[PDB]
Amino acid sequence: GAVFAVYLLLLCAAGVMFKVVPGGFIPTQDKLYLIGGVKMPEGSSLARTD
Amino acid sequence: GLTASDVVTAMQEQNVQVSAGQLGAEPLPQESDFLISINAQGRLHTEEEF
């Protein structure tokens, strides 16, 4: 009876785990490059951007 | 003093897509600071304009 009591709580704990562990997809990983760029003021020429 | 074909030609001339170009585009001896697109309306929309 006591082990079944613990099992019931552990089961509840399993439920909380799925709620406090953040959901994810693909872990971010170093893909060996970074993405840079720039937005210049509207109306700027390509020469200013360059 | 008009023909059907005069009327069709005038309608084709006066309801038409317009390419209006830009100011400050290449090539320039010194770098431009701005690139400015031009709008000119060519197409008609209402019975009144037609």
Of A6, A44, A49, the residue nearest B34 (C-alpha): A44
Helix (H/G/I), strand (E/B), else coil: A7: helix
CA quadruple B4, B6, B9, B15: dihedral, nearest 10: -90
Experimental approach was X-ray
* The token pair that represents A42 in the structure block: 């509207």
Three-state SS sequence of B1-50: CCCHHHHHHHHHHHCCCCCCCEECCCCCCCCCCECEECCCCCCCCCCCCC
Q: Flag if B34 and A47 touch (Cβ within 8 Å).
A: no
**Resolution given for this structure, in angstroms:** 1.9
Q: Is A43 on the interface with B (CB under 8 A)?
A: yes
* Cβ-Cβ contacts under 8 Å, A45 against chain B: 24, 31-35
The 10 Å CB-count burial string (b at 16+, else e) for A9-47 is eeeeeeeeeeeeeeeeeeeeeeeeeeeeeeeeeeebbee
Q: Flag if A48 and B31 touch (Cβ within 8 Å).
A: yes
Residue A12 to residues A5, A21, B12, Cα–Cα distance (Å) = 11, 14, 76
CB B44 within 8 A of CB B14: yes
Q: Flag if B24 and A44 touch (Cβ within 8 Å).
A: no
Give the position of tokens 């697109």: B37
Of A2, A31, A48, A29, the residue nearest B33 (C-alpha): A48
Give the position of tokens 């005038």: B10
